[PDB]
Amino acid sequence: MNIFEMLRIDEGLRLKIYKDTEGYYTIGIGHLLTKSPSLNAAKSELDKAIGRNTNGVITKDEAECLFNQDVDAAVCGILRNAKLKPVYDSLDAVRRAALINMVFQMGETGVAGFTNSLRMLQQKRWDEAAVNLAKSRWYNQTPNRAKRVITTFRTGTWDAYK
Ligand SMILES: *C1=C(C(=O)OC)C(C)(C)N(O)C1(C)C
Ligand SMILES: *C1=C(C(=O)OC)C(C)(C)N(O)C1(C)C
């Protein structure tokens, strides 16, 4: 198991534009296209991301291509953020993947706002951090996925993904 296999489980794979759990146009392995309600706006975003006129459908190879860029962008966002980089640097590789997972789902700024959870992770107070992380809109709106990510933070193992 690794961050790619982890997010592939959490995000799925769909080759046509669909609406994500928030109602936002998405494609591939959780590639958010736009929060705009305009399907043409989402299709324009898709064409720009792929470099061709797609009419809202991509191939599996294209989906995996976007996914690799998106995982990279999540890591890049963490390492440039003054709030997230210290926590990331302090973590083992499995818990690092859990933080990347959260940034992939909610964005750099969103995760960087989890000030008290981040402190608890930095302190390596894993059970306490797990309790705090669940006190969130994130957990309430996607509880099964959040439970898996939180278990990964709590234990430092892949138990929730096997
Ligand atoms: C990845 C791609 C790919 O692997 O599909 C063959 C394309 C669509 C060529 N490219 O735009 C990226 C780099 C996104
Ligand atoms: C890092 C980036 C990156 O390396 O994506 C793979 C982008 C998204 C260009 N950038 O905004 C940071 C600095 C976060």
Numbering used by the authors: 1 to 162
Provide text from the study:
Here, we introduce a highly ordered nitroxide side chain, designated R9, attached at a single cysteine residue via a non-reducible thioether linkage. The nitroxide side chain formed by the reaction, designated R9, has a stable thioether linkage that tolerates the commonly used reducing reagents and has a short linker that positions the nitroxide close to the protein backbone. The R9 side chain has been introduced at solvent-exposed sites in T4 Lysozyme (T4L) carrying cysteine mutations in the pseudo wild-type background. Structures of R9 at two helical sites in T4 Lysozyme were determined by X-ray crystallography and the mobility in helical sequences was characterized by EPR spectral lineshape analysis, Saturation Transfer EPR, and Saturation Recovery EPR.
To identify the interactions that constrain the internal motion of R9 at helical sites, a 1.60 Å crystal structure of T4L containing R9 side chains at positions 65 and 76 in Helix C (T4L 65R9/76R9) was solved and refined to an R-factor of 19.8%; refinement statistics are provided in SI. There is little difference between the backbone dihedral angles along Helix C in T4L 65R9/76R9 and the T4L structures, indicating that R9 does not distort the local helical geometry. Remarkably, the 2FO–FC electron density map reveals a single conformation of the side chain at both sites 65 and 76, with nearly all non-hydrogen atoms resolved. Due to the short linkage of the R9 side chain, the nitroxide ring resides close to the backbone in the {t, t} rotamer and is sufficiently closely packed to exclude solvent on one side of the ring. In addition, the inter-residue interaction of the ester oxygen with Cα-H hydrogen of the i-3 residue is identified as potential Cα-H···O H-bonds. Collectively, these attractive interactions stabilize the position of the nitroxide ring and are apparently involved in the relative immobilization of R9 compared to R1. Interestingly, the most probable distance for the 65R9/76R9 (20.08 Å) is significantly longer than the interspin distance determined from the crystal structure (17.56 Å). The rotamer at 65R9 is the more likely candidate since R9 makes direct contact with a symmetry-related molecule in the crystal lattice that may stabilize {t, t}, and such interactions would be absent in the solution.
